[PDB]
Amino acid sequence: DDKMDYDFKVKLSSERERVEDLFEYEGCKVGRGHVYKAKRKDGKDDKDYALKQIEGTGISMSACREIALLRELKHPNVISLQKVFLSHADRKVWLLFDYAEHDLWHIIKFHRASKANKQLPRGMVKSLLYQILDGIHYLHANWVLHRDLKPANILVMGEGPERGRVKIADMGFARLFNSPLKPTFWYRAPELLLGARHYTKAIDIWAIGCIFAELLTSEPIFHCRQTSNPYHHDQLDRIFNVMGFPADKDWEDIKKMPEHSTLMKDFRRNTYTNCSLIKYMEKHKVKPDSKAFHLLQKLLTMDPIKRITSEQAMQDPYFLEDPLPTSDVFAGCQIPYPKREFLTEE
Amino acid sequence: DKAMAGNFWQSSHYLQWILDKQDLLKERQKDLKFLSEEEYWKLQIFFTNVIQALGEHLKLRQQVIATATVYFKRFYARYSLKSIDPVLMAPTCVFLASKVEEFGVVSNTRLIAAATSVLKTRFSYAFPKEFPYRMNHILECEFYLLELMDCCLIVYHPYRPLLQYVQDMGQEDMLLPLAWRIVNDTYRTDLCLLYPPFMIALACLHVACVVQQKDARQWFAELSVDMEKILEIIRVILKLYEQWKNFDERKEMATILSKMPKPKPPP
Numbered sequence: 001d002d003k004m005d006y007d008f009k010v011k012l013s014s015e016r017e018r019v020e021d022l023f024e025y026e027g028c029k030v031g032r033g034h035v036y037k038a039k040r041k042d043g044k045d046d047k048d049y050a051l052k053q054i055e056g057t058g059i060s061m062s063a064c065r066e067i068a069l070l071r072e073l074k075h076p077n078v079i080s081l082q083k084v085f086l087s088h089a090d091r092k093v094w095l096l097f098d099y100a101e102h103d104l105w106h107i108i109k110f111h112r113a114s115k116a117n118k119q120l121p122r123g124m125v126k127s128l129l130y131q132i133l134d135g136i137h138y139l140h141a142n143w144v145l146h147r148d149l150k151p152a153n154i155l156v157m158g159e160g161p162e163r164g165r166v167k168i169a170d171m172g173f174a175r176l177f178n179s180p181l182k183p184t185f186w187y188r189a190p191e192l193l194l195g196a197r198h199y200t201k202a203i204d205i206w207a208i209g210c211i212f213a214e215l216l217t218s219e220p221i222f223h224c225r226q227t228s229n230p231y232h233h234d235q236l237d238r239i240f241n242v243m244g245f246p247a248d249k250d251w252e253d254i255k256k257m258p259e260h261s262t263l264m265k266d267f268r269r270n271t272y273t274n275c276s277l278i279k280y281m282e283k284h285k286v287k288p289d290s291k292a293f294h295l296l297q298k299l300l301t302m303d304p305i306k307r308i309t310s311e312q313a314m315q316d317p318y319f320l321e322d323p324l325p326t327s328d329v330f331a332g333c334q335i336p337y338p339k340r341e342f343l344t345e346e
Numbered sequence: 347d348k349a350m351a352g353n354f355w356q357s358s359h360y361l362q363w364i365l366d367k368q369d370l371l372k373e374r375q376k377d378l379k380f381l382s383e384e385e386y387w388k389l390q391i392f393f394t395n396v397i398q399a400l401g402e403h404l405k406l407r408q409q410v411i412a413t414a415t416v417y418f419k420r421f422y423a424r425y426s427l428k429s430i431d432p433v434l435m436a437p438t439c440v441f442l443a444s445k446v447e448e449f450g451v452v453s454n455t456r457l458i459a460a461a462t463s464v465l466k467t468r469f470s471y472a473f474p475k476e477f478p479y480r481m482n483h484i485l486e487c488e489f490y491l492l493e494l495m496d497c498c499l500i501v502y503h504p505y506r507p508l509l510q511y512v513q514d515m516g517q518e519d520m521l522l523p524l525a526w527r528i529v530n531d532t533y534r535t536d537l538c539l540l541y542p543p544f545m546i547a548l549a550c551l552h553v554a555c556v557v558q559q560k561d562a563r564q565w566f567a568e569l570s571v572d573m574e575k576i577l578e579i580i581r582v583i584l585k586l587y588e589q590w591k592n593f594d595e596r597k598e599m600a601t602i603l604s605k606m607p608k609p610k611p612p613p
């Protein structure tokens with residue numbers, strides 16, 4: 001600005017840390033949902049860092065809220081913002097995080113592919129679920145919803161001081177009026193599909209239920225093929241094929257859901273009479289009398305008010321049954337999952 | 347928005363933005379070469395009122411206006427009034443604070459229109475000329491503000507604990523409107539930079555009880571708090587109202603604004 005003090009302006013400019021001075025990231029793009037795997041340029045760490053360049057320019061509402069909340073949130077199972085760079089020339093924003101080598105999308109994909117080349121370790125499954133719940137419990141206790149939980153967002157740290165620790169990432173930090181109706185459906189709770197007007201803690205817990213099933217079987221439990229409207233017929237059909245159609249007593253307030261009459265129009269209870277979570281999970285070699293299953297069923301409760309909370313899930317006797325969950329989900333064993341490849345595509 | 351509600355003790359507000367009073371006074375000495383101490387606190391009152399008016403024009407809720415006010419105070423707690431024009435900083439603070447919320451957005455045209463309209467209709471005693479800044483200036487200023495604040499955007503305020511305290515008294519109808527109003531008035535001072543918000547709430551509630559002749563002494567005794575620090579806050583509130591009485595901002599602010607140190611231009 002012309003009316004800004006010149007001395008003030010040049011002092012700040014002289015002192016301002018620039019992302020390109022501190023970090024080597026060119027050619028090191030790993031993702032774009034622009035995410036880079038970066039090393040420090042001085043060579044004082046040799047640690048890997050994740051640099052996220054925020055999409056757009058300036059500071060949007062979504063960028064503001066993301067910076068706002070990450071700046072406060074501190075917990076071992078939630079991804080931790082190290083530093084923010086404000087690039088004054090191009091008005092671009094960069095976020096620095098510790099680098100998580102793995103995630104559940106890739107880990108599960110690796111096991112699903114290994115099944116073809118003929119299961120996920122059960123101590124690992126439990127430990128992952130425990131840490132996901134711990135991190136989500138922390139967010140929820142602070143009235144922060146994730147609003148977009150899926151395997152790609154459950155990161156897992158590689159070799160280093162936090163080996164095998166879960167890091168929840170990529171929270172949906174801005175949703176206009178906390179609304180799903182404003183601009184994959186596999187991890188979406190049935191109330192969202194029937195037109196729920198707000199995100200809730202319960203919606204996050206359903207997604208954890210979905211992830212947990214997927215870790216146990218290597219298959220997305222509510223897998224389905226790929227608008228403004230919340231009602232998705234094929235996704236609901238898949239839920240009922242797995243779960244059965246809910247009885248009136250299972251979800252009394254279903255009648256209040258905005259899409260209830262559409263549900264009645266398109267679906268018949270009779271269609272799903274041979275369908276249940278018990279039957280589904282048995283086919284995938286998970287016993288219905290297992291503590292794992294009983295907890296899974298409490299997470300995948302259809303009526304959101306009857307869904308277990310994160311804190312209650314952490315207290316489940318499943319976590320007291322042998323084997324105990326471990327802080328490193330790999331339990332000191334060798335990590336077979338491949339590292340992320342650098343992308344060279346234009 | 348209850349995001350981070352019970353996290354004050356591990357918050358950036360508490361760990362980074364509760365300042366030492368002597369560090370505040372030391373940094374203020376550079377602007378005290380131009381303005382007296384009286385004139386400096388009068389300027390603070392003026393820009394608190396400017397921010398309030400901008401927020402009311404944009405129909406923002408009190409808590410958003412308070413956050414914006416805290417941003418403004420944090421900036422000038424570190425930096426001279428010459429560094430960035432406070433006329434530019436004030437709407438920039440409101441704009442940034444509104445973006446921390448996800449319930450509605452403040453557009454560019456609406457922000458500038460609001461700055462233009464509020465200064466000409468409510469502050470022409472201080473500003474004969476039209477609001478000269480365009481949206482590119484706001485966006486530039488926003489980057490400087492965010493940098494100075496070390497990206498600390500979540501701000502806690504006395505409104506939430508006040509509401510809890512009065513509901514605990516069973517005296518919401520009698521005491522809340524006055525106590526709330528007094529909380530608004532504390533932003534005319536440095537209190538928000540110096541004390542946890544719940545302590546400021548307790549002080550405002552005390553003053554409200556004294557003004558309305560309500561005996562709440564036993565209720566205050568039932569709390570586990572440092573009442574010395576509460577009394578410190580009470581004294582600043584009582585002083586604020588005497589300052590208010592003796593200050594005519596409408597007659598004085600044009601002259602006071604002319605004494606503000608002016609930005610060094612480029613060479």
Ligand SMILES: C[C@H](O)c1c(Cl)cncc1-c1cnc2c(c1)CCCN2C(N)=O
Nearest residue numbers: 030031035050097098099100103152169
């Ligand atoms: C920014 C991101 O949240 C992230 C962070 Cl903070 C830290 N370490 C790794 C990552 C990260 C990189 N890449 C991918 C993912 C995660 C998810 C799975 C998809 N993905 C790719 N590269 O495909």
